[PDB]
Write a protein that binds this ligand. Structure first.
Ligand code: ROL
Ligand code: MG
Ligand code: ZN
Length: 321
């Protein structure tokens, strides 16, 4: 079983990694093994003097805080976003662009980006006067929570993976991670995309030229947001599994709403839903506009990813008539 897991992990640098198989082969530890593999591949343990035992202790602890009974926003999704970010970071157009600390920040942010997710949306938490919404004043409720949990867990016994970073490095990484995870709030999508389009239009090359730090964090924010919204760009057998999972989570939220006498949110009514039309709409209005813009920034590095997205859109559309 360990040999079979080792075989699947050879594809860690490839779009379309069999992440569900890795989750099963690792004994429900996809986040831990994928993060460990990526840290080794990028030589991050040596660069930041991270003890291996500390890294594993932190990762297992973090993974434990993803909920086992939430269909989509679980440790498998975290592992997938981590691995997807890892691939985007290695795009030829961005070679030598980011510092080792910026790379560490992006991968760490991806790992913690949805930790302790309850399987319901920010709007649901707000509308139900939840403890989380009261704590966070209705603003990036989940995302603020994911960050607080991810950082707080570093303080557990033998969990501080940043113990050998300088004070300056820890301060910088903390700010970058906060800026990145907050950008995963799906209410910020339109502003994030508008800013990304402006960067494409004012692009300078010779490899992308991002001498300014404010431009670099903006690229990392969009990168992680792309990874978060990468399901429809993956091979169809993976994409369909992600669709099944998000719909299960949405339908469960709708059951909670219906039990409370609340109006059922869009796409959350199992008795009145069109999964296929909803995926086509999701791609057309959100995912394709985002990915076409990313592809333009790194042209032509992401062409195969965009082609797959387009093929998947056509497939889902073809099932409707
Ligand atoms: C695989 O699909 C999806 C994958 C990811 C998301 C993110 C944005 N909202 C979330 O809760 C997470 C939505 C999806 O589809 C939604 C729109 C159509 C139905 C669900
Ligand atoms: Mg999220
Ligand atoms: Zn996510």
């Amino acid at each position: 079983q360990e040999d079979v897991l080792a075989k699947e992990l050879e594809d860690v640098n490839k779009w379309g990694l069999h992440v569900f198989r890795i989750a099963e082969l690792s004994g429900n530890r996809p986040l831990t093994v994928i993060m460990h593999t990526i840290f080794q591949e990028r030589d991050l343990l040596k660069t930041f003097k991270i003890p291996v035992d500390t890294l594993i202790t932190y990762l297992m602890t973090l993974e434990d805080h993803y909920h086992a009974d939430v269909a989509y926003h679980n440790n498998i999704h975290a592992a997938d976003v981590v691995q997807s970010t890892h691939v985007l970071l290695s795009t030829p157009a961005l070679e030598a662009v980011f510092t080792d600390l910026e790379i560490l920040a992006a991968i760490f942010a991806s790992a913690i980006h949805d930790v302790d997710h309850p399987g319901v949306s920010n709007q649901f938490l707000i509308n139900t006067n939840s403890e989380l919404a009261l704590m966070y004043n209705d603003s990036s409720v989940l995302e603020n929570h994911h960050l607080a949990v991810g950082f707080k867990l570093l303080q557990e016994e033998n969990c501080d993976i940043f113990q050998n970073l300088t004070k300056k490095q820890r301060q910088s990484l903390r700010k970058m991670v906060i800026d990145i995870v907050l950008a995963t709030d799906m209410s910020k999508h339109m502003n994030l995309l508008a800013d990304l389009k402006t960067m494409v239009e004012t692009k300078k090359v010779t490899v992308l030229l991002l001498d300014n730090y404010s431009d670099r964090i903006q690229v990392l924010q969009n990168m992680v947001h792309c990874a978060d919204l990468s399901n429809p760009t993956k091979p169809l057998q993976l994409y369909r599994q992600w669709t099944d999972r998000i719909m299960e989570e949405f339908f469960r939220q709708g059951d909670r709403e219906r039990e409370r006498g609340m109006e059922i949110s869009p796409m959350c009514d199992k008795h009145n839903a069109s999964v296929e039309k909803s995926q086509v709409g999701f791609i057309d209005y959100i995912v394709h506009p985002l990915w076409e813009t990313w592809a333009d920034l790194v042209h032509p590095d992401a062409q195969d990813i965009l082609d797959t997205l387009e093929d998947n859109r056509e497939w889902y559309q073809s099932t409707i008539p």
